[PDB]
Every structure is written in C-alpha cells, then in structure tokens.
Amino acid sequence: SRSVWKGPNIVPLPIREAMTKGTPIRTNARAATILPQFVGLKFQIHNGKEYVPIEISEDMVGHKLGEFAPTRKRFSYTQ
Amino acid sequence: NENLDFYSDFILRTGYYLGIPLTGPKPLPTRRERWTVIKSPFVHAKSKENFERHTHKRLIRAWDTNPEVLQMLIAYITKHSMAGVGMKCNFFQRSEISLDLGSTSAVGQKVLELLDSPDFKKHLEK
Amino acid sequence: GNINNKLQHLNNMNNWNTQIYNYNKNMEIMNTMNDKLINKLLYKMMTLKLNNMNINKIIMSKTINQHSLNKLNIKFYYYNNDINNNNNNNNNNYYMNMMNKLMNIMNNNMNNNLCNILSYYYKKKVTIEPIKLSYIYLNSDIFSKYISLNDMDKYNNGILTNYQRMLNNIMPKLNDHNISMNYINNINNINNNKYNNMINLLNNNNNNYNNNNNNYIGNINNIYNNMTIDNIPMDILMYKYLVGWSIKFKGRLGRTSTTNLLNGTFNNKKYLWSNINNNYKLNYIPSNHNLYNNSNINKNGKYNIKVKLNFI
Amino acid sequence: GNFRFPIKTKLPPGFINARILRDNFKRQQFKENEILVKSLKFIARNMNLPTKLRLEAQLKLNALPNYMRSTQIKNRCVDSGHARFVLSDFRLCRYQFRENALKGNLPGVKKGI
Amino acid sequence: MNVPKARLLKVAELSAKIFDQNFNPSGIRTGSKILNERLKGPSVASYYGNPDILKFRHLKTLYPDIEFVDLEEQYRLSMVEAKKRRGKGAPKKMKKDA
RNA sequence: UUACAGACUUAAGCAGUGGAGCAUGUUAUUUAAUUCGAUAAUCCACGACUAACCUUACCAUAUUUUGAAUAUUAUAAUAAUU
RNA sequence: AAACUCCAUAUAUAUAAUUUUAAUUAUAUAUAAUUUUAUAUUAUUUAUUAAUAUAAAGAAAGGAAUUAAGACAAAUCAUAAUGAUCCUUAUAAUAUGGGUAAUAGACGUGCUAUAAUAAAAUGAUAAUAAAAUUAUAUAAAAUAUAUUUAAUUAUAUUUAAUUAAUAAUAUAAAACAUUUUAAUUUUUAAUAUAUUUUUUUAUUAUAUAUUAAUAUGAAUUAUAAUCUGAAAUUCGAUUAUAUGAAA
Ligand SMILES: [K+]
Ligand SMILES: [K+]
Ligand SMILES: [K+]
Ligand SMILES: [K+]
Ligand SMILES: [K+]
Ligand SMILES: [K+]
Ligand SMILES: [K+]
Ligand SMILES: [Mg+2]
Ligand SMILES: [Mg+2]
Ligand SMILES: [Mg+2]
Ligand SMILES: [Mg+2]
Ligand SMILES: [Mg+2]
Ligand SMILES: [Mg+2]
Ligand SMILES: [Mg+2]
Ligand SMILES: [Mg+2]
Ligand SMILES: [Mg+2]
Ligand SMILES: [Mg+2]
Ligand SMILES: [Mg+2]
Ligand SMILES: [Mg+2]
C-alpha cells in the first residue's frame, strides 16, 4: 500500500488522444493508479497474454489497472 | 601472527634508534569470521563444512615525539614491510584553540539544474 | 623450537596464495580477484613457439602473491626442459633462447616490462621473481601439470609398463626412520652445545644485589661458540628429503577408469620421537604433504592427474 | 556491430556469460545515473515543493530504463555466474568458495575447528 | 522537563546554526535524507573486477619478438576443423539483406 | 553347511510427530506458463543463506542477427615509425 | 593405524606508561595426564597381576582432526568444465507484462495454540550474558504524531559518536517480587462483625444456558496510516480501530 503522502503512481499514458478521439488506451502498466481524470475512458489492460477491455467508473478511482485484468484461469480438477 | 609479531619487533628496534619511546606490541582481541558451506555441489544439505578466518591485531604506541621524527618512523617501516601485514596509524596533534589560516554536493547541484529545466519550470510558473 | 625458527617450520602465511591484509575489505577482494586473473594470464604466456615444430612448453606453478604495504611480489616456480640446444658447447652464450626472452620481459625490458603494466592494474609497485626448478618432482603443482599435459601419450592407452617404472625409480628409497633419528640427534647436539657454553660461561663468572635480577650471561661469542652458519643452518632445515609419492589417474583414457600409483612413505616420524609438533596447513593438510590436481582434455574428454608428495 | 545493450560497455575481465553481461551492464548504468535518480527522488519526496513538480519528478522516475534501477542489481559468482548462495566476502557461490578455500586462494581462509 | 519548551527550542535552533545542521521544527518531510545518502555507484560497478586487464590478444603487439601460443584457442580451432571434416559443421548464417 | 563373537536389534526416561489453524516443501490437477531438478534408506525450509521487477531457467507480444570470443581480409579515423 | 598433534582446561613468562580498561582482560611462548602412589578384598596364567574398595597427590573432567579399499555404473551436464549429438532469422540475444504464489485430494517439515507446577501486566541511582556486526554503514540522545501527565510500542523529524578492545546495533531474556486471571456462588456487592483487617464470619442479592471456547486462542476479514523501492495489482513488511474462526 503506497504511502498517501507520496501521491499516486503516475505513469506515462496517452490520455489526451483518448479524451479528444474516444480511442481505447492499450497499456501494460498494470501498476498504474486510476486517477480521477481516467473516469469514463476506455482501457485495454494487458494480463500477460491478452488485453482486457475495461471502462473506468467512479468506484475504480484509487485502485490500479492490474486489479481488473485477472492473469490466471480459475482452477478446476478432473473429478 | 608470525609475520605480525616479527614485524612488530622490528618497529620497536627502529623507534629506539630514532629516539621514540614505544610501548607494545599490545595484543588486541582477535576477530574470528566464520562461513558454513554445504559440501555437495547440488543437494545433500545435511553435511556442512566449516571455514574460518582470524584477524590478528597488535597496537604499538608512540609517546613524547616530534611530528617529523614520527613521520620518519612510518616511512622507514613502510619501506620494509612484510607480506600480509596491514597498518593503520592514528596521529594525535595537540593544537591551540585559535589558529592562523585554519587547520555543494553533486545531488544538490543536479536538483537545481533539474528545477530550472523546462520540464519543471513549466509547472513552477505561478 | 620448531615453530620458533624460520628453518624448521613453514610460515602459515605461505599456506595462502594471496598474502595480504587490507583494512579496506573491498580492495582486498579486488586484489584477490586480480591475482587469480593474472595467474591465468601467466599460464597462457608459458607456451612458446620458435617454429611450427618447435613448441616449448614451460610448466609453471601457481603464483605466490606477496602483498606488502609498499609493493606486490609475484613469486612462482617454473620448469623448462631445454630441448633445442642441450649440448656441451657454449653456443647458448651468444643468443637468447625463447625462455630467456620470456623471462626478460617480466622485469628487464625497459619499455614494456610486464611489471609496469601490472603496476597500473594494481596501483602499486610490482615485481616478478621466477625461480627455476630443475626436476619436475620437486613441486607437486609442476609435476601434475607435466603428466597431465605432456605424458598423455603414455597413459592414454593405459599406463605404460615403462612409464610406471620410471615413476617408481625417481628417488632412491631413503630410510625415513634413520633420517628422522639423525635429524633429532643433531638438534640434541646443538641444544647441548649451547647449554654447555652457558654453564661454562657461568661457572667461570664470565654486585651481588644485581646478581639476583639480571639474566645477561655474557659475551655473545661465548654463548654461541661453535654455532656458525656453516654447521647449524643446513642441519636443521626441514622437508629436505622426498620420502614418498603417489600419482593417480582418472577419467576416460566407454567408461572412466582410475589407476593409482603409490610409492614410498606418507608420514613423518620426526614428530613422534621428539617434542616437535606437526602443523596442518589450512587446518586440514599436514605440512609434510603437498597435494595438487591437474586436468586436461583428450578425445574422450576430461581426465585428472592427482599427485601427492611427502617431503620430510 | 550489434551490441545487445543500448550503450557500449566494457566486458568483465574474467568468466563471462549472458547473465553476467546483463548484470554488469545494469551495474555500469546504475553508476552513471545514480545522481540523476537521487535528484529526481529528492524533488518527488520534498514536501516543501509544489505537488506539480513532485508529480513531474515521479513521472520522470517511472520513465527511466530498467538498467538504471538499483534494485535490479543481483550479486553473482564472479567465477561461475551462479546467482544463489553468493558470499559477499568473496563474491563466490558456496561451491566455488569451498573449492577456492581448499586451494588456498582466499587470503586468510582456513578450515574450521 | 520543567525547562520551558520555548527556551529549549531557542537552544536547538542556535545549536543547529553553529553546527551547520538542518533545523526543521515542524517535522515536514524534506527529503534531506536522500541528499545525504552516500553514492554506492563506484563500489557496485566494480563487482566483476577491473576491465582494463592485459589480455592474450595484446601480447602479439606488446612483445612482437616472442610468439605465444593459446592452447585453449588452438584446441577450439582443431575441434572446428574436425567437425567440418565429419560433415557436422555449422550451417551458414542467414544474411539480414535476404 | 557347523559353531562362535559382535553388533543388529527392545526397554526406560524427557519432549515431540501423527489431531486444529497457519507457514513452508512435495505430489496431483489446472494453466498461455504454472521453469527445471532432487524425489526409500541416501527427496520433500532439498538445490534455495531471502522469486514484486531483477533473480529466471517458463509464457505472451514486440524486437536483434558475426551476436561476448579469436583470427583472416578490406575500409576508413588516429598516433608513432620510416 | 594409533599415536604425535590442534582446541578446551590449569599454571608460568612476556606485552599494556590498567582512559581503546574487560588486568575478573587481551594473545604470544612454554609446561601439564594416555594421571600417579599405598593398602585391603575377590578372582586369576596367584605374580612384580586384574577387578574392587580405602587412603594419599593432583585443576585435570571433554573434544576435533588424523587415512586405505570397495560398492550402489547412488546425486549433480542447473556451481563451473569435457566428448558425442542437435539448434544457427533461433533451441542464440534484448525489452514490456505475466508465471514460478493457481487449488479437489494426499504427503513431509515447521510455527502458534487448546489457562492456574501458567498466562498477562509492572519493576530507573536500571539483577545477571556470550558470540557477532557496522565505507555497497551501525544509528544515539532529543523532538513531533499515534496519545493520554509520563512511560511503553510504532513511525516521522534530526543524524551525536564510531569505520571500532574506544561509538552504535543493545538497559539480554527467562529468573525473582507484586498485581491480575474465565471456567469457579472458589466471585462480587450491600449491611453487620472480628484479637485473620490486602482479611474472617453472618444474612441477603450476584443467571441462564452449558460439553462446554473465556478476560484462553488469533485464523479470517473491513477501514485508515506507515516502511523499502522507479514500481507493492497479480504478489512484500509494519501499525491503529474493528472483526474473533478452528482448536
Ligand atoms: K509488483
Ligand atoms: K582495569
Ligand atoms: K512474478
Ligand atoms: K496460559
Ligand atoms: K546484554
Ligand atoms: K471464544
Ligand atoms: K501488493
Ligand atoms: Mg536483490
Ligand atoms: Mg502437522
Ligand atoms: Mg522479465
Ligand atoms: Mg520474474
Ligand atoms: Mg536424475
Ligand atoms: Mg517454488
Ligand atoms: Mg544492569
Ligand atoms: Mg531514540
Ligand atoms: Mg533490567
Ligand atoms: Mg517478564
Ligand atoms: Mg486474548
Ligand atoms: Mg469446537
């Protein structure tokens, strides 16, 4: 849990183009912190193999992009 | 210890002729370093070999001597030093309270340069 | 007595190939790494060629790096068999053979001596002292390297019956027990010569109050009468006679095979019959025993030559 | 002609493998940029400065290549390249330490009692 | 403890001034620690040894008179020729131009 | 095949293992990958005296092609020699 | 091979101007035991003997290393190294992210716990250690916040001393004393009572449920903050409030 006094984990992203054009933002920066500006924008977040499409709501601010792109498949046994 | 003691004896002889009162060699506590290894290269972590290293120490003190004579002692014993012996010398100089003519970091400089660059000045604008 | 005399015991400092102590531990690690790298480099400078069919291989031991406060001395033993001009003439007095050319670049060459190059690598004065050994069985390291690298045609199809025989007639079979007892008698004689000298110098009187504090017995000459450099030094020197030697082979010379040659004694009786005490080098190797291993590559692959010598 | 790393670096003098080359490159670039990283970290963590300058420094820090990261330096055995159980007193793995120690290569190391 | 805090703060400030120390009465995080940490770059970058060591390739120009033989290199070249004779050589490497 | 002797082998005592939660290793299964061993005694906090990145050996995507070496032959830039 | 050794132990000498202080120490050298002697008893190969006890002398009671042979063609080609064979625009090289942390069952090894011969608090002229570490550092005291008079614990601020027999990590802990402790009506409280007074006795009230989980236990989980790092999402550590499972 990053100390609040340090601020958000800001990463270089193309937000201006996604706000003037509406294009999805494809990124591997799973550590990035969802800033309040991101709300409404569409992100394609790498999960190690594919890019998961996700639109950001107001209940996602503060969390990190990686939290919404699961990297493992649910476990199953050959019962 | 063998070269250490032999060399210490030589220093006392050098000092005597130079007129330097010397005391010692006082033996200081020997330091022991230890390392434990597993003898096998890959597995078998149940058989472990022990290794150690001992640092032997000696203290020779000089008294009531002028700085110039003390430097001659250090120069001579340096010229004729033995293999595997190290030497640290603490010099003590008594001085007057007030003397005549007396007896900026890299990071700070770069910070000033960075805070003047456009990538930072573009924000500091008030 | 044995450990209090420079001629009767091996200084423990000699058990290590890098003889150094630096307060700055990082500089000590760096010096140690530099000694291994230079040792490898020197091994690559020992093979010389005059013509395609004249390749002279000098067998070099591991280096002894003596780090003092002011200089570094690199001491190593080398063996060279002069096969190009092994005559009874003095033609060698008018040219420098390849081995002399190699040894003269260590210190003598005024422009590109290896010492000056190394002096910048180490940031201290450096000297190199090559010491020539005339036999290959006087140093365990040289002996192993020779077999491994030069005697391959003798043990690559099994150990030749002549090769083994030569490795068993190298030294006459000295009687260790009498040599050990001769050494102990000489020590007793020297010890009894000094006690008699003092007893006589005291009984002859050479302040009664001062005759209870001082221990000065008298003139140095009388105390050491008949104890000179011509009779004391060579009689007390240790590890002077090879009394045992074991040469082992192993590897593929389609399965690995090991052959062991054992000849002589691998113990010292000077320690049993006398108060003299043995010392273990690196705390696990007896002082008398010197063991070294050298490996090489053949058509099948890696094979190791393990030689052990017992000098008493 | 085609060096594998963005900047030209000298090779280590001893044993070499790809992993040693990668670790050594990171060590050299950490030294060249150590001051830069400390200066940016200072600006980003100095609460007396405005938040905008602090966030600018944090962004610049996140954009630095991985070969400038101190935390990516890993101590490896200078003789074998193995990166597990490496003794820092000799920069050797346990096995190479034992072999060197018994050969008398380590300045003052003897077998324990 | 009975000494008024104002008096103890005046002593701290003056003392810090004389000894060229940073006086931060509020306690705001200033980053001064970062500015004081030591630079470990030189030690870290020397881990693998001094790169400017004499190498075997430099011996043919330092000592032109002497002809040294690299047995390790020589062994490698013989193994390459042997594999060429058995037909087990290496495939020709593709050219980027292609 | 005989007879010996040895240990081999139980007992006693202290605290434990085997039950709960958690930590950790392994197996199995899953997975784009869950790197690879070791894996009765003699594997299973073992290799590993520290897997967020690095480490890393695995997977996805993108990218490099004489690559880290030695030598040969050209081309240049540079300093000496002549 | 054993011994001869080395360590430990006891002692002696040397060294320290006894403020680098631990002289009750440090570490060089040397000595000592593989103990010795007397007597009685029981056995004997009965003698110049063993087993025993008794007396006397002694600090003397413990350890390590110490090599030869063979086997399991036992582990390792993943510490590094070699042959053969295979890849060579890829089975080599670099970057970003992911994985090695998945979860039905099973196994090994640990940790914590299931309360009264045992857990919790508190103990400042500071009960009592050893062995280590500090130039790719160890961090004192103080101040501020959590947070309350203060202490304690955690972090921040600041960075004293020491690169060390000197200063720091670091006032060891258990022990011991006092207090407290569910199950337990074995308690607590209100009156009265005492020559048990930190306590006794009497009369009332103090629960019900209950083979059971408490003021035992601390898994799981919510929220906030902090530490390292460029970065803590998969996947780190710490703290506070709340949660309080199995046993
Ligand atoms: K991470
Ligand atoms: K004292
Ligand atoms: K990972
Ligand atoms: K309890
Ligand atoms: K303590
Ligand atoms: K409960
Ligand atoms: K995390
Ligand atoms: Mg690391
Ligand atoms: Mg269990
Ligand atoms: Mg990676
Ligand atoms: Mg990884
Ligand atoms: Mg296997
Ligand atoms: Mg794992
Ligand atoms: Mg105390
Ligand atoms: Mg404090
Ligand atoms: Mg206390
Ligand atoms: Mg307590
Ligand atoms: Mg509780
Ligand atoms: Mg229950």
For residue B107, the chain E residues in CB contact (below 8 A) are 34-35
∠ Cα A7 A8 A10 (to 5°): 125
Residue found under tokens 């692959």 = C301
**Both tokens of residue E27?**
């306690």
Residue B107: how many CA atoms within 13 Å on its side-chain side?
Answer: 18
Structural biology method used: cryo-EM
**Cα separation, D32 vs D69, whole angstroms:** 11
The protein footprint on chain G, as nucleotides within 7 A of a CB, is: 2-7, 15-17, 20, 25-31, 63-69, 73, 75-76, 78-90, 92-100, 102-104, 131-133, 135-137, 143-144, 156-160, 163-166, 224-234, 236-238
**Cα separation, E1 vs E4, whole angstroms:** 8
CB C18 within 8 A of CB D105: yes
User: Which residues are paired to C60 by β-bridges?
Assistant: C78
For residue C41, the chain E residues in CB contact (below 8 A) are 53-56
The dihedral built from the CA positions of residue C186, C190, C192 and C196, taken in this order, carries a sign that is positive
Give SS3 for B9: helix
**Both tokens of residue C5?**
């005399």
Query: Is A4 touching D (CB cutoff 8 A)?
Result: no
Residue D42 DSSP one-character state: H
For residue D37, the chain E residues in CB contact (below 8 A) are none
Query: Is E39 touching B (CB cutoff 8 A)?
Result: yes
Rounded to whole angstroms, what are the CA distances from D35 to D72, E34, E35?
17, 10, 10
Quick check: C28 and D107 CB within 8 A?
A: yes
Quick check: D111 and C284 CB within 8 A?
A: yes
User: Which residues are paired to C285 by β-bridges?
Assistant: C281
Residue B81 DSSP one-character state: P
**Cα separation, C49 vs C228, whole angstroms:** 48
For D32, name the nearest residue in chain E, comparing CA atoms only. E41
Cα E61–chain centre separation: 29
Instruction: Evaluate whether chains B and A are touching (3 or more beta carbon pairs less than 8 Å apart).
Output: no
Helices (H) and strands (E) in chain C, counts: 9, 13
Q: How far is C21 from chain B (nearest CA, A)?
A: 5
Helix (H) or strand (E) holding B62: strand B48-62
Amino acid in position C22: N
Q: What is the CA radius of gyration of chain E?
A: 34
- List CB contacts of A62: < 8 A, sequence separation 6 or more: A33, A34
Instruction: Evaluate whether chains C and A are touching (3 or more beta carbon pairs less than 8 Å apart).
Output: no
Quick check: B105 and E34 CB within 8 A?
A: no
Rounded to whole angstroms, what are the CA distances from E71 to C27, C49, C297, E68?
32, 12, 11, 9
Q: Is the CB of B46 under 7 A from strand F?
A: yes
Largest separation between any pair of C-alpha atoms in chain A: 52
**Cα separation, B39 vs D95, whole angstroms:** 7
| Count of all residues that appear for chain B in the document | 126
CB C227 within 8 A of CB C194: yes
For residue B106, the chain D residues in CB contact (below 8 A) are 35
Query: Is D50 touching A (CB cutoff 8 A)?
Result: no
Residue found under tokens 């070249």 = E77
Quick check: C105 and E66 CB within 8 A?
A: yes
User: Which residues are paired to C250 by β-bridges?
Assistant: C304
Quick check: D109 and B123 CB within 8 A?
A: no
Distance B31 CA to ligand 16 centre (A): 29
Rounded to whole angstroms, what are the CA distances from B46 to B33, B37, B40, C110, D97?
22, 10, 9, 57, 18
Residue B51 DSSP one-character state: E
DSSP state letters, A40-64? T-EEEEE-SSSEEEEE--GGGTTSB
Resolution (A): 2.3
Distance B48 CA to ligand 9 centre (A): 27
Residue C12 DSSP one-character state: G
Q: What are phi and psi of C292, to 5 degrees?
A: -145, 150
**Cα separation, C287 vs C285, whole angstroms:** 6
DSSP H helices, C108-258, are 114-122, 140-150, 152-155, 161-166, 176-203, 220-223, 233-236
Rounded to whole angstroms, what are the CA distances from C105 to C80, C99, D5?
17, 10, 38
For E33, name the nearest residue in chain B, comparing CA atoms only. B107
CA of A22 to C1' of G192 (A): 90
Residue found under tokens 């000056």 = C116
Amino acid in position A41: L
The torsion region of residue C58 among left (phi > 0), alpha (psi -120 to 50) and beta comes to beta
CA of E89 to C1' of G87 (A): 12
DSSP state letters, chain E? --S-HHHHHHHHHHHHHHTT----SS-----HHHHHSPP-HHHHTTTT--S----GGGHHHH-TTS-B--HHHHHHHHHHHHHHHTT--PPPPPPTT-
For C15, name the nearest residue in chain B, comparing CA atoms only. B84
- CATH domain D18-103 topology: Helix Hairpins (1.10.287)
| Beta-strand runs (E) in chain C | 18-19, 47-51, 54-57, 59-60, 64-67, 71-79, 125-132, 242-251, 259-264, 280-281, 285-286, 289-297, 302-311
The dihedral built from the CA positions of residue E50, E52, E58 and E63, taken in this order, carries a sign that is negative
For residue D62, the chain A residues in CB contact (below 8 A) are 9-12
Query: Is B30 touching C (CB cutoff 8 A)?
Result: no
User: Which residues are paired to D110 by β-bridges?
Assistant: B52
Residue found under tokens 């007193």 = D89
CA of D2 to C1' of F66 (A): 9
User: Which residues are paired to E68 by β-bridges?
Assistant: C48
CB C42 within 8 A of CB C76: yes
DSSP H helices, chain D, are 18-45, 51-62, 94-103
Give SS3 for B60: strand
- Nearest of D78, D16, B118 to residue C34 by alpha carbon: D78
CB C122 within 8 A of CB C269: no
Total structural domains in chain A?
Answer: 1
Across the interface, of C55, C112, C121, the residue whose CB is closest to E62 is C112
**Both tokens of residue E3?**
């000494």
- List CB contacts of C62: < 8 A, sequence separation 6 or more: C17, C39, C76, C141
Q: Which domain holds residue A29?
A: 1-75
